[PDB]
Amino acid sequence: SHMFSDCRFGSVTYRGREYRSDIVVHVDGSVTPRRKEISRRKYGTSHVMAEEELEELLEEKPESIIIGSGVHGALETGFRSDATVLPTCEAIKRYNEERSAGRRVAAIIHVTC
Ligand SMILES: [Cl-]
Ligand SMILES: [Cl-]
Known part of the structure; x- marks a missing residue:
């Protein structure tokens, strides 16, 4: 069962483990640290997400990419894509939805924020 089971400022729980930093959830259920440097190098801040951040996910050929723009959704996207951007606590619900339905998410x- 690859589900998020908790969302709150500064923390989310995925597959029974709490993460207090930004993360990337891979199609197979794996978790890796978000590569904030990619965006910091391109924009001078990681508050604007570079599309390059999605590049590592595009290889896994997902049917849907969900982006949790954070608690209070301050984080902004610097591109147009099929990816679904939603406030984090709303993003995890949507993720659980698709993952529950069997989608490569x-x-x-x-x-x-
Ligand atoms: Cl981490
Ligand atoms: Cl950030």
Whole structure:
């Protein structure tokens, strides 16, 4: 069962483990740290997400990419894509939805504003 089971400022729980930093959820259920440097190098801040951040996910050929824009959704997207951007606590619900339905879903979650 690859589900998020908790969302709150500064923290989300995925597959029984709490993450207090931004994370990338891969199609297979794996979790890796969000690569904030990609965006910091391109924009001078990681508050604007570079499309390059999605590049590692595009390889897994997901049917849907969900982006948790954070708690209070301050984080902004610097591109147009099929990816679904939603406030984090709304993003995890949507992820659980699709994952529950069996969809190849991947996500990038921002735990703060
Ligand atoms: Cl982490
Ligand atoms: Cl950030």
